[PDB]
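Quick question: what would this complex look like in 3D?
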Amino acid sequence: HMLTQGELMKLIKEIVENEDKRKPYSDQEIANILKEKGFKVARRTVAKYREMLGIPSSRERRI
DNA sequence: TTTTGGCACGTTTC
DNA sequence: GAAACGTGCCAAAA
């Protein structure tokens, strides 16, 4: 929690668009991996961020 | 089924 | 007086 100007912003799209665009993550799953490396942001925040950056859900982009 | 939006609180500083 | 940041549950939407 209590991150910078975008320590979870400039990261949610920089890993998800690099892994498996044919098998996307979710606001829970991205919130989880971000706790393993230094962000420890919850799903409530990360949801509001993939909204503001530019992602509709990535499920709807993939399917 | 899965993924996600609206409402409210904690914190600190102005 | 108020903002800003992440964050707790609820139900809504595909």
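Answer marked as accepted. Residues 2, 26-28, 43, 47-48, 50-51, 57-60 of chain A lie near DNA strand B (CB under 10 Å from a C1').
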